[PDB]
Amino acid sequence: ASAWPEEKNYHQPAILNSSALRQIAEGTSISEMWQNDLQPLLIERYPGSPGSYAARQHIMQRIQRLQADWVLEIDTFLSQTPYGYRSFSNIISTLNPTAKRHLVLACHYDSKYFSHWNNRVFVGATDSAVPCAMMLELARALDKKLLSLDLSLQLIFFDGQEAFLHWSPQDSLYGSRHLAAKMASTPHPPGARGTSQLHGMDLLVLLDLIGAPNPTFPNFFPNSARWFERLQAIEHELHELGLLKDHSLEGRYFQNYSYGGVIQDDHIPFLRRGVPVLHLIPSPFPEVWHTMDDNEENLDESTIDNLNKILQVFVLEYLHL
Ligand SMILES: CC(C)(C)OC(=O)[C@@H](N)CCC(N)=O
Ligand SMILES: [Zn+2]
């Protein structure tokens, strides 16, 4: 039996030199992302709504225009909810579908349901319109390098992350609970006898609640800590080369501390099935968490810009591009 599923345990990154780093920093455009990827997503988009459909089309359209050979799949399913049976649609974008191993970046594109209050609508700017846009900007910014692509890249935009009422084991993580179970029972690579698509998940990098000022991301798991350190190293180098905006080491995003317990998110259904996770959610959460103020006005542009550069470098180094 092949031990390829163990390759992830020994995988090392291909570190970019100073020259390559300035190039990545110059390759991403925060204003471009803002107008073309984020704003169309700042709409009410709870599951089943017109917005959900519009968001899903935007994400697909934005990926299809790229040169990289992206394969888009809409994973639609039914699930019981506090309001009865409903339909959900996860969006999966994969480069090299048969590539045994894949680095996976993810977030949820649905927005928590709230009945209109004082003519205000909840759009979950940091939760998680920004993460969505960041993934799209990354796809755009590294498009040329990704075009050259047994390890590849995959993006997952989960639907139904939010609870329709208040968090509950049965009410929340609809999309991820469904996709995890599905991938866990789908042979991979095609024709495989005893390995699943989950065996193929090298690492799940989940972005959530990003876009607020001064985020502090803690290290959550020992089996992905070496990767958390890479993010620290990248942030440090990008900073020393003066490639970050209004950024200080004292107030850096990736600090030297782990988090005791765990935070409920889309990674749970995967983590509980053995998938290594790098959970990029800040602790504490943005002040605007689940408030009508989690809007565009309260987003920190330079912070998102800095994070884009960091994430993009991490991905290129992980994929040896
Ligand atoms: C629905 C649940 C509670 C699972 O997740 C969220 O609200 C995430 N937006 C943020 C993560 C969190 N646990 O607050
Ligand atoms: Zn939320």
Q: Is 235 in the pocket of ligand 1 (CB under 6 A)?
A: no
- Asked if 309 contacts 247 with a C-beta cutoff of 8 angstroms, the reply is no
Experimental method of this PDB entry: X-ray
Domain 1-321 in this protein, CATH class = alpha beta
ω into 284 cis (within 30 of 0): yes
Instruction: Look up tokens 């929340």; give the residue.
Output: 172
Residue with CA nearest ligand 1 atom 13: 264
- Residues having C-beta closer than 5 Å to ion ligand 2: 127
The answer to whether residues 183 and 272 touch, using CB atoms and an 8 Å cutoff, is no
The ligand 1 atom at the shortest distance from the C-alpha of residue 163 is 1
Distance, CA 254 to ligand 1 centroid (Å)?
21
Residue 49 to residue 256: CA distance in whole angstroms: 41
Ligand 1 pocket test, pick from 162, 265, 268 with the greatest ligand atom count within 8 Å of Cβ, gives 265
Ligand 1 centre distance from Cα of residue 162 (Å): 6
Q: Which of 259, 292, 298, 302 is nearest to 277 (CA)?
A: 259
Distance of CA 275 to CAs 13, 79, 137, 281, Å? 19, 24, 25, 17
d(CA 91, CA 62): 13
For the chain, the three-class secondary structure string (H helix, E strand, C coil) is CCCHHHHHHHCCCCCCCHHHHHHHHHHCCHHHHHHHHHHHHCCCCCCCCHHHHHHHHHHHHHHHCCCCCEEEEEEEEEECCCCCCEEEEEEEEEECCCCCEEEEEEEECCCCCCCCECCECCCCHHHHHHHHHHHHHHHHHCHHHHHCCCEEEEEEEECCCCCCCCCCCCCCCHHHHHHHHHHHCCECCCCCCCCEHHHHEEEEEEECCCCCCCCCEEECCCCCHHHHHHHHHHHHHHHHCCCCCCCCCCCCCEEEEECCCCCCCCCHHHHCCCCCEEEECCCCCCCCCCCCCCCHHHCCHHHHHHHHHHHHHHHHHHCCC
* CA gap 320, 303 in Å, rounded: 26
How many whole angstroms from 3 Cα to the centroid of ligand 2?
38
> Residue 285 CA: which ligand 1 atom is closest?
14
Tokens of 272: 């509980």
**Assigned token pair, 160:** 């139904």
Q: Distance (Å, rounded) from C-alpha 24 to C-alpha 17?
A: 11
Q: What are the sequence ranges of the domains in the chain?
A: 1-321
Record the resolution, in angstroms.
Answer: 2.2
Give the separation between CA 57 and CA 136, rounded to whole angstroms: 13
Torsion of CA 20, 22, 25, 27, to 10 degrees: -70
